[PDB]
Design a protein around this ligand. Structure first.
Ligand SMILES: COc1c(F)cccc1-c1csc(N2CCOCC2)n1
Length: 250
C-alpha cells in the first residue's frame, strides 16, 4: 500500500474559483482585486491541506502557522504552474477556471515578468515529464522550504520533517528506476525545479507588498488574512530574516 501517496492524493484541494467578473473589460484594479480574493480563498485551502499532511502535528504549534504563511506564495505558484500545464498546455496561466491570464492580462496586471516566469515553470512540468505523484510530493516538500534565521520554536522537529519529505521524494524517484545514476539525474532535475519557485515567489512578494502599501490609491482590495501575511510575514522574507532553503545554493 502506498500510504504516503494515498494521503497526498486524498488531501489535494479541489477547484477554487476567484469570483471575477469576466463579462466586463479588463482593468488593473478588478484583476488584482480578484487575484487577491483568490489568494484569500486559496489560503483557507492551503491551511487545511497543510494541517492534514503526514507528520505536520510534529511541528510545534507555535511554528505551524508560520511555515504555512511563509510558504503560501510559493505553494500557489507551483500549483498554478501545474494547473496551467495540465489544463491548457501552458497557453495561459490558469490561476482559476474564472481567472485565466492571457498575455494581455499578464500585461494589464503589471506583473508581466512574474507571469512569464510562471509560464516557463508551467512548460517545465511538461518538458521534464513531471508525474502527478512527483508533483504532489514536491509540493509538500515546498511547504518545508523556508526558515527563519533566528530559528523556529522547535527547529529540530522541522528539520526531521523536512528530511522525511526528501526521503519520500527519493522513494518516488526510485520506484521505476533500476539504476542509482538515473535516480541522481532525476533528483537533480526536480530540486532545480523546486529551487526555481523561490525567486518567482520573491518577485510576487515584492509586488504584493508594494501594492498593499499603495492599495488605497489604486482601488485594490486586500482581504484580511492575506493582508496580514503581506504586512507581517512577507517583510520578514524581503528583509532577509526568513530565507528559502535552496538545494543548489552557492
Ligand atoms: C491563487 O493565486 C495565485 C497563483 F495561483 C499563483 C501565483 C500567485 C497567486 C496570487 C494570489 S494573490 C497573489 N498576490 C497578491 C497581489 O500581488 C501579487 C501576488 N498572488
Amino acid at each position: 500500500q502506498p500510504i504516503f501517496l494515498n494521503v497526498l492524493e486524498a488531501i489535494e484541494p479541489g477547484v477554487v474559483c476567484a469570483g471575477h467578473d469576466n463579462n466586463q473589460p479588463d482593468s488593473f484594479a478588478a484583476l488584482l482585486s480578484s487575484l487577491n480574493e483568490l489568494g484569500e480563498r486559496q489560503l483557507v485551502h492551503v491551511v487545511k491541506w497543510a494541517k492534514a499532511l503526514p507528520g505536520f502535528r510534529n511541528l510545534h504549534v507555535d511554528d505551524q502557522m508560520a511555515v504555512i504563511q511563509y510558504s503560501w506564495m510559493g505553494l500557489m505558484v507551483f500549483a498554478m504552474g501545474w494547473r496551467s500545464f495540465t489544463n491548457v498546455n501552458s497557453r495561459m496561466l490558469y490561476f482559476a477556471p474564472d481567472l485565466v491570464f492571457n498575455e494581455y492580462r499578464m500585461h494589464k496586471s503589471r506583473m508581466y515578468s512574474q507571469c512569464v516566469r510562471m509560464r516557463h515553470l508551467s512548460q517545465e512540468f511538461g518538458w521534464l515529464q513531471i508525474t502527478p505523484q512527483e508533483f504532489l510530493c514536491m509540493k509538500a516538500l515546498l511547504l518545508f522550504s523556508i526558515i527563519p534565521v533566528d530559528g523556529l520554536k522547535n527547529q529540530k522537529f522541522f528539520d526531521e520533517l523536512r528530511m522525511n519529505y526528501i526521503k519520500e521524494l527519493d522513494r518516488i524517484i526510485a520506484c521505476k528506476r533500476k539504476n542509482p545514476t538515473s535516480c541522481s539525474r532525476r533528483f537533480y532535475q526536480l530540486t532545480k525545479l523546486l529551487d526555481s519557485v523561490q525567486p518567482i515567489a520573491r518577485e510576487l512578494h515584492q509586488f504584493a507588498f508594494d501594492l498593499l502599501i499603495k492599495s488605497h490609491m489604486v482601488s485594490v482590495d486586500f482581504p484580511e488574512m492575506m493582508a496580514e501575511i503581506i504586512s507581517v510575514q512577507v517583510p520578514k522574507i524581503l528583509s532577509g530574516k526568513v530565507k528559502p532553503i535552496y538545494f543548489h545554493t552557492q
